[PDB]
Design a protein around this ligand. Structure first.
Ligand SMILES: [K+]
Ligand SMILES: [K+]
Ligand SMILES: [Mg+2]
Ligand SMILES: [Mg+2]
Ligand SMILES: [Mg+2]
Ligand SMILES: [Mg+2]
Ligand SMILES: [Mg+2]
Ligand SMILES: [Mg+2]
Ligand SMILES: [Mg+2]
Ligand SMILES: [Mg+2]
Ligand SMILES: [Mg+2]
Ligand SMILES: [Zn+2]
Lengths: 100, 59, 76, 142, 142, 119, 62, 65, 192
RNA sequence: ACCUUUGGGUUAAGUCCGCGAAGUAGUGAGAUCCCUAGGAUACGAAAGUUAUCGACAGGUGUUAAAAACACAGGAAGGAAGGGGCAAGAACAGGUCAGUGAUGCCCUUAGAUGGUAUGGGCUGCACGCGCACUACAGUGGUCACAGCAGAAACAAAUAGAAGUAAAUGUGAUCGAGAGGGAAUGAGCACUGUAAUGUGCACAGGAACGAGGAAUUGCUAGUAAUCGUUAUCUCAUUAAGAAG
């Protein structure tokens, strides 16, 4: 019955498009469709001096990479899970599944 | 240091010269007119334009 | 001269006569009028507030304030 | 169900929640302690201040529980004071006539606006090249 | 009910301390009269009965923990509760824990009297230790 | 519209021993003809003697500041080794607006205002 | 001895002095016809009352 | 490599083996340039602060704020 | 606990029937705003005359958080002044508040020295102080007198507060704050 | 050669308004972006989260325009606050000791190339730059509570990394019981190796508020107080970055 699908992605526009596409698919099948849950973004960061030597005013930069994520929890029969999984390929988004 | 500037002022004058029949004293009316009549993407710019249009109209 | 570590009988006698008609009195007064140390101004002052000769009017943290026989507060 | 309202009050990084309810007797608890048992007097002074500009007859037949997290000892007392202040106005608007809400609100607004609105004030971030938000490290010449 | 919060800590900790000593429920560590409570402290305690104030305050930590339904208390938790700021010469002061040996001895004494039960992830109260506290408070507030 | 191609056309011409001026002028024509709304080219090094210099060229519209630079601007850098030292080449191109989103952004710059005509 | 005159400020004119610390002001005395020109150094609002030690010493430059 | 050393006990007759722990600069050379100094070790990068800034945008790091 | 009546300072003092008693000062001294404890966070400092609307005893405790090491210790200041009011109310016999008011009235210098010369050398001259500056200096002097008096002396700090404030209200030579007000006015006159 | 023309008002800004032998488009500024403050009708049955929304000198009063201020309502009021990005031209400014970036000169089996075991980079008459603890009572000591940014913590009988500290109440001490420098015989830890670190006992130096000079800082700022599942890191922070 239940499935939880994690769409994980370090680009916001892609994840927004792919989730809108999958939401449209859900509402076109109409199994009591719903929005995705927007997850707390993972943020990995590094802070370093700009100059390659000691000279000048010490100026510092913070680089941060953001891994966005969205979860769909959903009700489907096993055939529809097996058949719909054909949607979950050729994406820069990484896709993962949980089941009970 | 709140000066409208040349882009905003040019656009505002073109609007009053052509839609005077549609404007009133009210900022909230005037903003509904510029949201229709113009292509302004930035939220901060459409407030500057609609504020400038009310001032021109009353002059 | 340095301060003292006793309240001898004749200093004790005259302090009783002196504490009446004084208003607010504090650790320092006993130690700067008479020659007593702070460690013996505390002990004497605490004694007189058990004997009902003086009355305590504040004791917030270590700051501690007393009153004698011619004190009188404000009235509404 | 018993008549109730819930409110939230904020100061710096402290957040507090107040629940307010119908009662036969006026009752108030903070950190599970009554006002006559609670260990910090600044909190107790800030509570009895706001309880006197509001008339005692407006706090009658009413009960309060305050809970809070974050900030520190001075900031939480103001956070609690806003949560308490907003509960009475919320209850009057919901369970009595709206004129009494307006009357009470004029009194609190005359006394202190910051009892009903939250200060947006927070600590400023540290920048590089100094110990804190604005102070610079010591330049030298010779 | 959460009966403990109805009385002030600086009346409760001194009150129980006498009931402990008059029944010898906890026994002093060897050299209690010259040992310090932490490496952060400057000198040994001014009260000879400091060991009993520790025992009285340990049962208070457990009563309030039970009142709020927290997870059981560990030897590490108690060591950080009693911690302080250590003096380091020519360097900033730094936070340091209490010494475990005192706390271990108190908890093992209380185990033998049936006052404290060891769980897999901490220590917990027992019926007798709850009822002593209950019957004290019922006199003390009156 | 690819700066990484054009920079390699430039690097080639240095090895072919052709003047930097002629090479750069050709590159700018190609970039503009293909529809780029502007571009920047800089050459730097021991280019005409023992004293090193850099020569920079600008054509059309180029954006330097803010978020509009991240969506309209494309850059490449390369270097060529010669008998006297390394000569460095920088190319930047500003993409055209494109309503189907192939050649550049769909939406034009955030600060441009357009007022509709009347019936 | 505590002689004093009370005067009402009617106008302010100029920020004055090294660093612009002072303000030139016009003051009328409360119980006399006299109206003076004076420099004052604090923040001043029109309709303030100020206490003078002399009714005569003047800043003629105005 | 985890190298091993022999050591003798107090009798100078019985022998035992102990392992050398891998620590210090000797194995943490920059993956782009073999440098021993200014190596960022976080997130299992092993890249020096000079090399990081030229490659950061290829890896996918950005300066947002 | 102690009371169920109207708002009194430290829950003790009357908070009514208060007179300034110098018309030059009237508008700039807040003895209106009924507060139980001399503490407020009211954000008036970001305004044009907002620091003149802060209540009187508040301005007076702020003056104590000084000498560097005591920055930020506002609770300590309240503890100190509370005790001083007990000493003063006792000694004087009148609302500590009227002692504080009269201390300010006397301790502000009325005439001052300043550089006037613009288009040449800077020559010193007498000048006349505004109402607001006059009270700002009064608090400053009262504070500076107290701090330096207590430094390496056996007497308790709340007691020194009572010594100075009485004397100041009574305009006696005994006050550090009053003496230094005479000095400034004499030098001002010398440069007249 | 070169100048585009009369220098009057305004803004942070040739930012703009007037007027002109000039007129039209651009770069730079602003806008945009990121964080902080307010906002479900969405999602969840847990009680939060996120949000294409909200402010424009818009309203009144100030009698050319551009603007500015004072009130008022408002979560928020004059660039909303704080960052980030950021013209053209320059400089014989710094780095060949970051680079399988690199020209030219030099060395190249008795090496200026590697490796291994040790020693130095940490030496001490002395002049300077930047930090850290102080000179007490607005203190010191004992105990007891109690609160962050949020959430990670085998065990330990004197003691030998960890989940705040200022702070709140009561005691105490009484004017070098403030202060912890050089040093003694010890007791442990990390390590391939102590020289490094922790702990206990003794010891108790200058310093009683600083000459000529000199450095930042306008509000949740300065100063105070702790903390780093941040960086260095086997072990080492009195350093940076939060
Ligand atoms: K260059
Ligand atoms: K420096
Ligand atoms: Mg110390
Ligand atoms: Mg731009
Ligand atoms: Mg600028
Ligand atoms: Mg022109
Ligand atoms: Mg910008
Ligand atoms: Mg050079
Ligand atoms: Mg060295
Ligand atoms: Mg000491
Ligand atoms: Mg360093
Ligand atoms: Zn590298």
């Amino acid at each position: 019955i239940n499935v939880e699908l994690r769409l994980l992605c370090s680009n916001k526009k892609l994840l927004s498009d792919l989730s809108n596409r999958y939401y449209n698919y859900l509402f076109q099948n109409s199994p009591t469709a719903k929005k995705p849950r927007v997850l707390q973004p993972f943020i990995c960061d590094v802070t370093t001096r700009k100059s390659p030597c000691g000279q000048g005013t010490a100026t510092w930069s913070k680089y941060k990479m953001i891994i966005h994520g969205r979860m769909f929890a959903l009700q489907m029969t096993h055939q529809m899970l097996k058949d719909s999984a054909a949607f979950l390929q050729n994406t820069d988004v990484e896709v993962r599944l949980t089941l009970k | 240091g709140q000066i409208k500037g040349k882009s905003v002022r040019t656009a505002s004058k073109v609007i009053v010269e052509r839609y005077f029949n549609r404007l009133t004293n009210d900022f909230y009316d005037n903003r509904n007119v510029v949201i229709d009549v113009a292509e302004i993407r930035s939220k901060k710019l459409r407030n500057k334009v609609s504020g400038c249009v009310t001032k021109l109209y009353k002059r | 001269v340095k301060r003292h570590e006793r309240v001898e009988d004749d200093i004790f006698n005259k302090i009783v006569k002196d504490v009446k008609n004084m208003r607010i009195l504090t650790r320092t007064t006993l130690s700067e009028r008479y020659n007593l140390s702070l460690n013996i101004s505390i002990k004497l002052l605490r004694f007189l507030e058990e004997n009902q000769i003086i009355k305590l009017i504040s004791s917030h943290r270590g700051s501690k304030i007393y009153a004698g026989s011619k004190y009188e507060p404000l009235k509404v | 169900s018993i008549a109730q309202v819930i409110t939230k009050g904020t100061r710096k990084t402290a957040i507090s929640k107040c629940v307010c309810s119908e009662s036969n007797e006026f009752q108030l608890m903070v950190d599970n302690m009554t006002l006559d048992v609670h260990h910090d007097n600044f909190l107790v002074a800030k509570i009895k201040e706001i309880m006197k500009i509001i008339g005692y007859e407006h706090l009658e037949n009413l009960k309060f529980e305050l809970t809070t997290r974050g900030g520190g000892p001075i900031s939480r007392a103001y956070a609690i004071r806003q949560a308490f202040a907003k509960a009475v106005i919320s209850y009057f608007g919901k369970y009595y006539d709206e004129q009494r809400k307006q009357d009470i609100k004029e009194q609190i607004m005359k006394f202190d606006r910051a009892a009903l609105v939250a200060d947006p004030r927070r600590v400023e971030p540290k920048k590089y090249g100094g110990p804190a938000a604005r102070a610079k490290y010591t330049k030298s010449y010779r | 009910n959460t009966e403990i919060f109805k009385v002030r800590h600086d009346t409760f900790i001194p009150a129980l301390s006498e009931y402990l000593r008059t029944n010898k429920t906890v026994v002093p560590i060897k050299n209690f009269d010259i040992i310090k409570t932490s490496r952060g402290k400057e000198t040994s305690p001014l009260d000879i009965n400091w060991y009993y104030t520790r025992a009285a305050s340990i049962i208070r930590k457990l009563l309030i923990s039970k009142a709020k339904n927290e997870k059981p208390l560990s030897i590490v938790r108690f060591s950080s509760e009693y911690g302080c700021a250590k003096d380091r010469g020519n360097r900033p002061n730094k936070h340091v824990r209490a010494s475990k040996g005192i706390i271990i001895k108190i908890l093992n004494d209380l185990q033998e009297k049936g006052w404290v039960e060891k769980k897999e992830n901490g220590w917990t109260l027992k019926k007798e230790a709850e009822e002593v506290s209950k019957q004290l408070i019922e006199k003390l507030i009156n | 519209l690819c700066p990484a191609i054009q920079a390699e056309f430039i690097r080639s011409k240095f090895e072919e021993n052709i003047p930097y001026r002629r090479s750069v002028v050709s590159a700018i024509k190609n970039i503009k003809s293909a529809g780029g709304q502007g571009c920047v080219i800089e050459v730097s090094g021991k280019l005409k003697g023992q004293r090193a210099r850099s020569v920079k060229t600008i054509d059309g519209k180029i954006i330097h500041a803010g978020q509009p630079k991240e969506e309209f601007m494309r850059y490449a850098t390369t270097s060529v080794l010669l008998k006297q030292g390394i000569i460095g080449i920088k190319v930047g191109i500003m993409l055209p607006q494109d309503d189907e989103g192939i050649k550049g952004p769909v939406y034009d710059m955030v600060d441009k205002i357009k007022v509709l005509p009347i019936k | 001895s505590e002689e004093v005159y009370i005067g009402e400020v009617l106008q302010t004119l100029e920020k004055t002095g090294p660093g612009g610390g002072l303000t030139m002001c016009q003051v009328q005395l409360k119980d006399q016809k006299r109206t003076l020109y004076r420099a004052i150094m604090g923040p001043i609002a029109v309709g303030d009352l100020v206490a003078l030690l002399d009714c005569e010493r003047e800043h003629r430059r105005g | 490599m985890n190298k091993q050393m022999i050591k003798y006990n107090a009798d100078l007759e019985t022998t035992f083996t102990v392992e050398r722990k891998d620590f210090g600069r000797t194995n943490r050379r920059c993956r782009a340039c073999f440098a021993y100094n200014g190596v960022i070790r976080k997130y299992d990068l092993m890249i020096c602060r000079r090399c990081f800034r030229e490659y950061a945008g290829d890896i996918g790091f950005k300066i947002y704020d | 606990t102690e009371t169920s009546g109207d708002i009194k300072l430290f829950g003790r003092y009357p908070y009514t029937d208060l007179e300034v008693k110098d018309i030059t000062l009237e508008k700039y001294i807040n003895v209106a705003s009924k507060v139980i404890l001399p503490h407020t966070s009211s954000r008036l400092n970001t305004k044009k005359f907002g620091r003149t609307k802060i209540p009187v005893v508040e301005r007076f405790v702020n003056a104590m958080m000084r000498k560097g090491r005591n920055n930020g210790k506002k609770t300590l200041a309240m503890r100190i002044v509370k005790d001083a009011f007990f000493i003063i109310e006792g000694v004087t016999g009148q609302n500590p508040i009227q002692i504080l008011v009269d201390a300010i009235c006397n301790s502000g210098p009325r005439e001052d020295s300043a550089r006037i010369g613009k288009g040449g050398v800077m020559k010193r001259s007498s000048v006349d102080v505004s109402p607001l500056r006059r009270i700002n200096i009064a608090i400053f002097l009262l504070a500076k007198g107290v701090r330096n008096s207590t430094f390496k002396d056996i007497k308790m700090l709340p007691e020194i507060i009572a010594e100075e404030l009485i004397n100041a209200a009574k305009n006696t030579q005994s006050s550090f704050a009053v003496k230094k007000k005479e000095e400034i006015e004499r030098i001002a006159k010398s440069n007249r």
